[PDB]
Design a binder for this molecule. Structure first.
Ligand SMILES: CCCCCCCCCCCCCCCCCCCC(=O)O[C@H](COC(=O)CCCCCCCCCCCCCC)COP(=O)(O)OCCN
Ligand SMILES: CCCCCCCCCCCCCCCCCCCC(=O)O[C@H](COC(=O)CCCCCCCCCCCCCC)COP(=O)(O)OCCN
Ligand SMILES: CCCCCCCC/C=C\CCCCCCCC(=O)OC[C@H](CO)OC(=O)CCCCCCCCCCCCCCC
Ligand SMILES: CCCCCCCC/C=C\CCCCCCCC(=O)OC[C@H](CO)OC(=O)CCCCCCCCCCCCCCC
Ligand SMILES: CCCCCCCC/C=C\CCCCCCCC(=O)OC[C@H](CO)OC(=O)CCCCCCCCCCCCCCC
Ligand SMILES: CC(C)CCC[C@@H](C)[C@H]1CC[C@H]2[C@@H]3CC=C4C[C@@H](OC(=O)CCC(=O)O)CC[C@]4(C)[C@H]3CC[C@]12C
Ligand SMILES: CC(C)CCC[C@@H](C)[C@H]1CC[C@H]2[C@@H]3CC=C4C[C@@H](OC(=O)CCC(=O)O)CC[C@]4(C)[C@H]3CC[C@]12C
Ligand SMILES: [Ca+2]
Ligand SMILES: [Ca+2]
Ligand SMILES: [Zn+2]
Ligand SMILES: [Zn+2]
Lengths: 687, 129, 687, 44, 117
């Protein structure tokens, strides 16, 4: 029924002379503009700073049409020059930005002509300076021209800043502060500005990438933009490394200091793309196989046999380092590959001896209260002390702030705590439990039994420590990276599962603990779910938790919900509770966990190569140093300016190669078509 | 599957070593036990963690649920040892039935998604061979 | 070490005058060519039909540069004109194809000049005629120009052809025959040729789509091309339907005959895109809700209550059709929605009564050998006879070749066979098993027990027949379409699983049947896996198959692999066999099945809307006809030229709208740029 | 060998023709057209 | 230098111009590049891409056939189906699974049963 359509936000309509003037400007006719500017000076007919409704001005339209003579005549006749430099920079044309930069000082007389109400619209926010927008557009020539004219960018503050000005600016106007910080970090993260205004582009890229990642972690709202900026910095560093052409340049880059100092810096800043670059991997492979040239060309049989014999020579070649470090045999342990194989052989020997400790050949006379340690345990004790001393040495060297970031040291700390606990329990049971009482009448809390239980748990942890050696192989590395990510998904799932388990255990125990029976009345003098006939399963909170845990694997029978008396309603309600818990934990939650880790595996399978190579590099460089040469059974037995000049010489060539590799890959179809059309129009007009 | 059973065999060996190290003191003879049998292949499930081979068999059969819960119960009333053994068995069950099997599901589903695009060329090559 | 690079396949190098001539041709200079052609006539310097090494000729280069005056002068001076029309057609330019078509007859004198060795290279196969290539390029103007000049395309033979010429051509040269057939079907499947040279484009598109799908099924090698052609025909038919603008045009299209005849034809040819078009779905919805206008606008409460009362009025309104079909009440059953709801209510009543037949209120005196049927069964028997008569009527009407394509009629046939079997067993047990012997001493093969077992299986099939009503709902349709596809994947999996099961059952039975024991020696006089104590499980092939089937769900215990004697090696080998079978069938095969149906679900979820709508249309049109008005409890109670003219009038507008909708969406960036460049060059040259 | 080389001649020449015609793209044709237009305008 | 040399040798134009047996040369270079991809860990993607380029070049050169006589001349050429055995030995899956080779193998397989399809 005739919805009325009308311009509800009506701009002031342009005058006819103004429409003619801007139509002449967009037409591109040079002759018609000049009479208009003279008549606007004399007769005051045309305001030169008028504004068509779609956000454009005569100077600004001349910017979009990239005609320079109309630019020169207009700006000779005193058009408002402000805010026009940003449009020229976004146009990415050298002539316009050079013309507006050059004629900022035309010997200005009587200040500026007055203007009222025409600084209404600007497509760019007021915090945008020309250098920031030039960095945003990422054009080498405009950035170079602006930097040549002594321009500056404000320094952003620390993320954890509590000074008066940052707090006041965040409190008064948080949106302006956030936009200003994001624009500053966007300007600082451009590859051209890093290549032009920083003497160490690789280190600057590393530090800005780390800072942007930390800002992404802190600032929740601009997470995508900060992550994109950090990725841009990381790929810029990777490309600048990739522009190398010789091994001498690569080893100058990697070994530059403020041995492989820059590689350690890159690992510390989590630069995975820089580390996993193929030439760095080749250099690390040549350093890793120091004494075995051509290791990749060998048939797997001779490689395997060499590993077989050098693993079986583990008690030798370590005492040789003790008695003669300067001999030909003594130097052969200092290579990283032999170090890794000897450590692996030592750990395999430790696991084999823990396997041998569980046999009846050695274990005799189990009916002693405090047993003396057997010959296997006497022999084991030096490896335990060696692991203790190695973990102590790793705790002092490197610092306490680096020992906790490995996340494998928690497992080693648990191992060490269990070993100290079982050693202490064995010695106290030796010194003050003399006797030969049979095991059938021992105390539940006998320290010998506690010692054996903690020994078994330490055995499991020691045998499961072998997961960390999977990065050395080429097939088990990305597999355990996927294991690491999907374990985090598993923890996220068990939060909800633990909540559901606690809820249903509370409900079942609240319903059921009246009917608790004693162990004497029940058959075989037992009480719990670990009996032949499954006894009361919901009589305590701990027992209910155990029963509802074991019900997931189907090891809990159905008759645990039956009571002695004939309370059919209570039994039915308990069976309904048990059935609802089973439906949740076996039809909903487990299948959700399946879908979650499958989705995460699909996302992580694309990047499964880079992080495996990063982890393998982190394992390789752990054996490069001389700290920790001996195996655990034997480690307890008692000019800078020239380098800076070479580094800057290499960075000159690398940066210039990278900027050439950008411009030639920056000329696209659209820009070439625009340049060809402009050249054809100019040639036709000139002819 | 072979890439998965490498890790599964390592985990199985670790937990079998732990359980056998905890439990082989309480090995009983076949004469004392009913029906003159000894092992997990009896009507009443006898000692399951008394040798390394028997522990390996029991931890293998526990994946399919054919191993009962009372195999972690000893003759005497050592409640702490029984609880520690039940904790070990529960941790092994959680790993091998909630983590590893579902990872294997995700792995072969991902590999099936990559291999389904080229399922025509290699079949024709095998048929030609 | 200096690998020698040389031209091993050297063409004859061009003469300098020939190079000058073709350079002048590709230059585009008109004046230079004419003196060359006169001097080649007089002095015989330049062979006009020479061939540069990259497969081009002077006429052919003039075709690529689309200059027509050089074309006219060259072909006036007698260039070899053959095979050049195909390049002009592939160039998709009207002027060149018109020029070569017009000057095929320049009053040719003394036949053609001789030519030797220049029909060496042609980019097009010799079976390509110009009309076929014009159809391949799918350009309206060139196809129209070629069709206007009385051109023909050979007719392909039937797929199942055994005549002498097809067999001889396939035997002598199979590649040429396959290429010719594929090219012919590519020419016939173009939308422009169907729109121009067929009086019934929709029917022609349907028939060619079905023929191409059948060829894709038969021809294994060109499956992708034939499937693409069938999809192209289907989308052409869908677009031609979609170009409608009014309901009168839509109902003229759908009801056209050689009521909804064309919709039945489209369903018969499996045109899913044609059927699931939104306007056809709207027309089918208006026909389906014939007596209930505005069914979509109602709140679900009043819709539900209307369904509630019209389902509960099922014994009424069906006898009213018997006693008064012409009454206001009698006509209300002929609408399709009331038909569907009454059939659903009848089936729900049947299922409710089969549920009521299993209660102790009715069943009395179980200790009779041959029982008379109870009042519930006496009342049930008319529904069984009604289902029989309905399936018989559906078998005669429509034909035997259509009754078997539903794939739900196998379930109905199994239901009917079970019902006849149980009726026959009940009547024979009535007539010749008179007595009251107690059930505890009955014969295993007593026909009463067989009758009850077959009755129970028929009950399961009757209650599982409700799956077919899921397409009526909007949420359970695509769900059961995915069920239908993943069931085929399940069958493909159970082939391999049945092979593995047979292998391991044979192995276990071969190892184990020596130790078979009798039922008397075993406790409780039972023998099998269905006992309290699980007896011999691998003693027969059937018992081994049952045990290995039940072991998948974990219901088979571990002590079934234990024998009476102490044969530890045999027990260990049997346990190893059982463990290997469990590992396969529960770690490999089941997870492969999971991955397979998840992958197939991911492919089928994109098209889950079209096939559901097709199935819902096929269910809707089953109730449109008057055959089968009564429910199963009551069905046993005793000018064409004007339509052709209107159809052609509609097809004229539809085809012309479709061809306009193609040309405007056929002008692209590249073609517009090429036309603009050619126009600019022509204008500059003319000026 | 002679028959094989005779077949390879035709196959290789067909393949190289099938590459050049599928090698002429939008960008190269636009560049060639612009260069030809500039050359013609300059010559005129 | 090695990667640049193998990139130069794996281009289809150089094989078509400077080798008298383009199919056999494509097969041998594809196998050599696959073996180099297996050996050289760092340039695995580039060597695999070069091997794929050689394989698709061989497949296209086979696909440019126009008659059964040309196909049986190509397949039966020796230094019966010698070149097909060579292609299987070099694991050329795209060359073998080409539709016309499959049609010829189907006609040889159903030797005494014409019209089996
Ligand atoms: C009375 C109770 C008795 C219980 C007896 C049974 C006890 C059984 C305990 C079993 C524990 C098994 C643990 C297996 C961990 C496997 C980890 C695989 C993935 C992996 O490599 O993760 C690394 C970290 O591991 C880690 O962080 C591993 C942490 C392990 C903690 C163990 C103690 C808790 C990653 O390495 P990364 O962190 O360097 O990667 C930095 C990347 N940017
Ligand atoms: C002594 C032994 C005693 C055994 C006792 C127990 C017996 C239990 C038997 C259970 C059988 C359950 C069958 C369920 C079938 C569900 C099908 C869902 C998917 C579906 O709708 O499929 C339709 C076909 O169904 C079909 O084709 C269904 C076929 C059913 C056959 C049943 C008999 C075998 C598709 O419909 P559509 O084929 O029209 O789709 C044409 C598309 N283009
Ligand atoms: C977050 C986690 C919760 C999410 C929201 C809920 C999810 C669905 C929960 C469904 C619980 C069903 C409980 C049924 C019950 O009481 O059974 C025990 C009792 C045992 O007597 O069952 C009955 O009494 C009724 C017998 C028929 C049960 C039909 C169940 C249909 C659903 C089956 C699901 C798949 C298995
Ligand atoms: C590589 C493989 C390892 C990866 C890293 C570890 C993964 C997670 C391991 C979780 C082990 C939990 C063991 C719990 C336990 O001791 O139970 C036995 C014992 C038996 O008494 O349980 C208890 O004593 C506590 C009863 C409550 C248990 C709550 C369990 C919450 C987590 C459930 C997970 C899903 C099932
Ligand atoms: C097509 C289908 C087949 C595909 C090819 C084969 C797939 C893998 C088959 C693996 C069979 C393992 C059989 C082990 C066995 O004999 O156990 C029974 C017997 C029972 O005594 O086991 C033993 O005697 C050894 C005890 C340790 C078993 C370690 C098993 C490691 C692999 C576990 C896989 C996941 C579960
Ligand atoms: C399969 C069952 C019996 C469990 C076996 C447990 C251990 C005996 C295995 C598990 C992980 C294995 C390690 C996995 C990976 C490697 C790296 C491998 O070296 C390489 O892959 C070469 C390249 C390099 O690392 O420099 C040498 C063997 C080693 C240490 C393996 C030694 C044997 C280990 C400790
Ligand atoms: C949930 C448990 C108790 C089993 C219930 C079994 C039956 C009582 C259900 C299963 C399938 C149901 C049918 C599924 C879909 C429909 C279509 C529905 O109609 C529509 O969706 C409206 C649009 C249209 O079909 O025209 C009317 C109910 C009906 C017949 C349902 C009636 C009730 C049915 C037979
Ligand atoms: Ca450590
Ligand atoms: Ca039927
Ligand atoms: Zn501050
Ligand atoms: Zn024929």
């Amino acid at each position: 029924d005739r919805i009325p359509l009308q311009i509800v936000r009506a701009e002031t309509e342009l005058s006819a002379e103004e429409k003619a003037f801007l139509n002449a400007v967009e037409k591109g006719d040079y002759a018609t503009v000049k009479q208009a500017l003279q008549e606007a000076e004399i007769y005051y007919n045309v305001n030169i700073n008028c504004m068509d409704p779609l956000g454009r001005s005569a100077l600004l339209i001349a910017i979009e049409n990239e005609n320079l003579e109309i630019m020169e005549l207009l700006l000779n006749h005193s058009v408002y020059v402000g805010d026009a430099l940003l449009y020229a920079i976004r146009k990415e044309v050298v002539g316009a930005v050079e013309l507006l930069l050059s004629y900022r000082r035309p010997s200005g007389e009587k200040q500026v002509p007055t203007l009222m109400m025409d600084t209404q619209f600007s497509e760019f926010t007021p915090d945008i300076t020309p250098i920031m927008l030039a960095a945003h557009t990422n054009n080498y020539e405009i950035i170079k021209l602006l930097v040549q004219k002594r321009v500056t960018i404000p320094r952003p503050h620390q993320i954890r800043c509590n000074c008066v000005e940052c707090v006041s600016s965040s409190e008064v106007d948080s949106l302006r502060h956030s936009r200003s910080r994001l624009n500053i970090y966007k300007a600082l993260a451009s590859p051209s500005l890093i290549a032009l205004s920083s003497e160490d582009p690789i280190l600057t890229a590393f530090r800005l990438g780390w800072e942007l990642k930390e800002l992404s972690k802190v600032e929740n709202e601009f997470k995508a933009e900060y992550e994109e900026l950090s990725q841009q910095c990381k790929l810029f560093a990777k490309d600048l490394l990739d522009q190398a052409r010789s091994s001498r340049e690569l080893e100058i880059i990697l070994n530059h200091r403020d041995d492989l100092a820059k590689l350690k810096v890159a690992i510390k800043y989590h630069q995975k793309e820089f580390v996993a670059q193929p030439n760095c991997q080749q250099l690390l492979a040549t350093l890793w196989y120091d004494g075995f040239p051509g290791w990749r060309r060998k048939h797997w049989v001779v490689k395997l046999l060499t590993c077989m014999t050098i693993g079986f020579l583990f008690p030798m070649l370590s005492i040789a380092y003790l008695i003669s470090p300067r001999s030909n045999l003594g130097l052969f342990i200092k290579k990283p590959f032999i170090k890794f194989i000897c450590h692996t052989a030592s750990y395999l020997t430790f696991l084999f001896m823990l396997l041998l400790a569980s046999q009846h050949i050695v274990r005799t006379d189990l009916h002693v209260q405090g047993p003396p340690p057997t010959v296997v345990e006497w022999m084991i004790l030096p490896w335990v002390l060696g692991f203790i001393w190695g973990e102590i040495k790793e705790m002092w060297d490197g610092g306490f702030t680096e020992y906790i970031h490995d996340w494998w040291n928690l497992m080693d700390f648990a191992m060490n705590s269990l070993y100290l606990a079982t050693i202490s329990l064995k010695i106290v049971a030796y010194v003050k439990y003399n006797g030969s009482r049979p095991r059938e009448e021992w105390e539940m809390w006998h320290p010998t039994l506690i010692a054996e239980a903690l020994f078994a748990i330490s055995n499991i942890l020691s045998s499961l420590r072998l997961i960390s050696l999977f990065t050395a192989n080429s097939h088990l590395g990305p597999l355990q990276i996927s294991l690491g990510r999907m374990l985090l998904d598993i923890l996220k799932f068990l939060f909800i599962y633990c909540l559901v388990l606690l809820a249903f255990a509370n409900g079942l125990n609240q319903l059921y603990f009246y009917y608790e029976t004693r162990a004497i009345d029940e058959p075989n003098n037992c009480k719990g779910i670990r009996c032949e006939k499954q006894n009361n399963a919901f009589s305590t909170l701990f027992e209910t938790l155990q029963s509802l845990f074991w019900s997931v694997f189907g090891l809990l029978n159905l008759y645990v919900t039956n009571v002695k008396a004939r309370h059919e309603f209570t039994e039915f309600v308990g069976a309904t509770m048990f059935g609802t818990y089973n439906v949740i934990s076996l039809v909903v939650l487990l299948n959700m966990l399946i879908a979650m880790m499958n989705n995460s595996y699909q996302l992580i399978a694309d990047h499964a190569d880079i992080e495996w190579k990063f982890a393998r590099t982190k394992l390789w460089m752990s054996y490069f140093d001389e700290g920790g040469t001996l195996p655990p059974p034997f480690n307890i037995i008692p000019d800078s300016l020239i380098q800076n000049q070479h580094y800057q010489e290499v960075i000159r060539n690398l940066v210039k190669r990278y900027v050439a590799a950008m411009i030639r890959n920056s000329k696209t179809h659209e820009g070439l078509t625009e340049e060809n059309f402009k050249e054809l129009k100019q040639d036709i007009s000139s002819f």
